[PDB]
Every structure is written in structure tokens, then in C-alpha cells.
Design a protein around this ligand. Structure first.
Ligand SMILES: CC[C@H](C)[C@H]1O[C@]2(CC[C@@H]1C)C[C@@H]1C[C@@H](C/C=C(\C)[C@@H](O[C@H]3C[C@H](OC)[C@@H](O[C@H]4C[C@H](OC)[C@@H](O)[C@H](C)O4)[C@H](C)O3)[C@@H](C)/C=C/C=C3\CO[C@@H]4[C@H](O)C(C)=C[C@@H](C(=O)O1)[C@]34O)O2
Ligand SMILES: CCCCCCCCCCCCO[C@@H]1O[C@H](CO)[C@@H](O[C@H]2O[C@H](CO)[C@@H](O)[C@H](O)[C@H]2O)[C@H](O)[C@H]1O
Ligand SMILES: *[C@@H]1O[C@H](CO)[C@@H](O)[C@H](O)[C@H]1NC(C)=O
Ligand SMILES: CCCCCCCCCCC
Ligand SMILES: CCCCCCCC
Lengths: 87, 79
């Protein structure tokens, strides 16, 4: 588990997968591991920065309606950035 | 850029604290602009000179606070 940083090995199982083929019936074992994806990374690298990005688009609601260049620069920038992050 | 050469982990790295902090200082800068500009166009001169005051304080508060941050940061992780 210490050499597996990105995931968490939550559960394991031991089963059989004996199958019937065209050349005959072959005995088969199957071990299964269950991998749970670590969330801390996606919290910090996706969700947090996107909320922070969406929140910035709001601070333009507090600029006078006359200074629209400021509003556009905010809305457009955050939007473009949002794209990049997604890519 | 930095975060791409790293494997997703389950803990908060000292690098994250430092990126996130600087991020805040710049975010609060924007907030400051909005605050200043909003209470500036207010009719009364009561708010207008308050607007001026906010800048004066920021011009010093920001650097001082960022310096304080650096000191705390480096003593905590440069150890
Ligand atoms: C706070 C989010 C809002 C949107 C603010 O964002 C900004 C400014 C604007 C908003 C006010 C910008 C943002 C940073 C935050 C400030 C955050 C910090 C200084 C640190 O984190 C805080 C909060 C964090 O809990 C959310 C908390 O951890 C606790 C609770 C958690 O569980 C809820 C738990 O998991 C954990 C174990 O213990 C922590 C101790 O302390 C710092 C760690 C954040 C770093 C953030 C980033 C580093 O690189 C990321 C990315 O590469 C990028 C491009 C953007 C960055 C960002 O998004 O920058 C980034 O995501 O402020
Ligand atoms: C280091 C350089 C700093 O530069 C200095 O900053 C301060 C504010 O932070 C300015 O001072 C500012 O606030 C005062 C408050 O009464 C105003 O009178 C002045 O109009 C304004 O510019 C100085 O005009 C400027 O000389
Ligand atoms: C792990 O545990 C849960 C509960 O027993 C079970 O539903 C799941 O199928 C298991 N996963 C594996 C791969 O064994
Ligand atoms: C009375 C206000 C004085 C403000 C000084 C600001 C200096 C900022 C330097 C940042 C490197
Ligand atoms: C660790 C976050 C520090 C943010 C300071 C913001 C001061 C304007």
C-alpha cells in the first residue's frame, strides 16, 4: 500500500473462473483486488481551483455597470482558464 | 506545471500550502479592487475617502502580511 500512492487497496477476493472453450473445459482461478481512487489530489487540483475560479467570476457583480471592460476581462478569463483546466 | 510531474497522493504537500497561499494573496488583491471601486463610485464623499484609505492600507498590509507568511512558511518547512 506504501508503493501504491494514488489508490487504496480496499478489498480482495479469491474466486474461480473455470470456463468451457472449444478445445475443452479448463480450470481457472481468479484473484481480485479493489482499488479506490485517492480524492485529495482531485480536491486540490480540480474542485478547489474551479470553485476559486467560479467565485472570481462573481466579484464582477460588484463593479459598477459602467466599467464593463473589467467585468468582461474577469468572466472571459475565468472561462478560458476553466477550459484549459478541463483539457 | 509542478503538479504534473507528481503522483496523486492522499496528503497535503508543503508545495500545496505555498501555491495556495500565494494564490490567496492575488485573489484578495482582486477582491480589494472590487471593494475599492465599489465604495468609490458611491455618491457621498464619506465612502470616497474610505476608498482611498483602503489602498493606502493595502500598499503596506499586503507586503507585510506576505512577508509574515514567508517567515512562518519557511520556518515550518525549511527545517
Ligand atoms: C479555499 C478555496 C477557495 C475557493 C479559495 O481559493 C483560494 C483563493 C480564493 C478562495 C477564497 C485559492 C486556492 C487556495 C485557497 C487557500 C487554501 C490554502 C491556503 C490551503 O488550503 C486550506 C483549506 C483546506 O481545506 C479546503 C485545508 O485543508 C484541510 C481541510 C480539507 O478538507 C476540507 C482536508 O483535505 C485537509 C487535510 O485539511 C488546508 C489545511 O488549508 C492550501 C492547502 C491550498 C492549496 C491550494 C492549491 C495548491 O495548488 C492547487 C492547484 O494547483 C491550483 C492551480 C490552485 C490552487 C488553489 O485553488 O488556490 C490549489 O488548489 O484560496
Ligand atoms: C515608497 C513609496 C510610497 O509612496 C507614497 O505612498 C503614499 C500612500 O501609500 C502616498 O500618500 C497617499 O496618501 C495620502 C494621505 O493623506 C495622500 O495625501 C496622497 O495623496 C496619497 O498619494 C504618497 O503620495 C506616496 O508618496
Ligand atoms: C470488497 O468488499 C465488499 C463488501 O464485502 C464487496 O461488496 C466487494 O465486492 C469486495 N470487492 C472485491 C473485489 O472483493
Ligand atoms: C504610509 C503608507 C506607506 C506604504 C509603503 C508601501 C511599501 C510597499 C513596498 C512593497 C515591496
Ligand atoms: C495562508 C493564506 C494566507 C492568505 C493571506 C491573505 C492576505 C491578504
Amino acid at each position: 500500500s506504501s508503493s501504491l500512492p494514488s489508490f487504496q487497496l480496499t478489498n480482495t477476493s479469491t474466486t474461480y473462473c473455470t470456463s468451457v472453450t472449444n478445445t475443452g473445459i479448463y480450470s481457472c482461478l481468479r484473484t481480485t483486488i479493489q482499488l479506490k481512487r485517492e480524492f485529495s489530489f482531485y480536491l486540490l487540483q480540480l474542485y478547489i481551483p474551479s470553485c476559486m475560479l467560479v467565485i472570481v467570476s462573481w466579484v464582477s457583480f460588484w463593479f459598477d455597470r459602467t466599467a464593463i471592460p473589467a467585468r468582461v476581462t474577469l468572466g472571459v478569463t475565468t472561462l478560458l482558464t476553466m477550459t484549459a483546466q478541463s483539457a | 506545471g509542478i503538479n504534473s510531474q507528481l503522483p496523486p497522493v492522499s496528503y497535503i504537500k508543503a508545495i500545496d500550502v505555498w501555491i495556495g497561499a500565494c494564490m490567496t494573496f492575488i485573489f484578495c488583491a482582486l477582491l480589494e479592487f472590487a471593494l475599492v471601486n465599489h465604495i468609490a463610485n458611491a455618491g457621498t464623499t464619506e465612502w470616497n475617502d474610505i476608498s482611498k484609505r483602503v489602498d493606502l492600507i493595502s500598499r503596506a498590509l499586503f507586503p507585510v502580511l506576505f512577508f509574515v507568511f514567508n517567515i512562518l512558511y519557511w520556518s515550518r518547512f525549511g527545517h
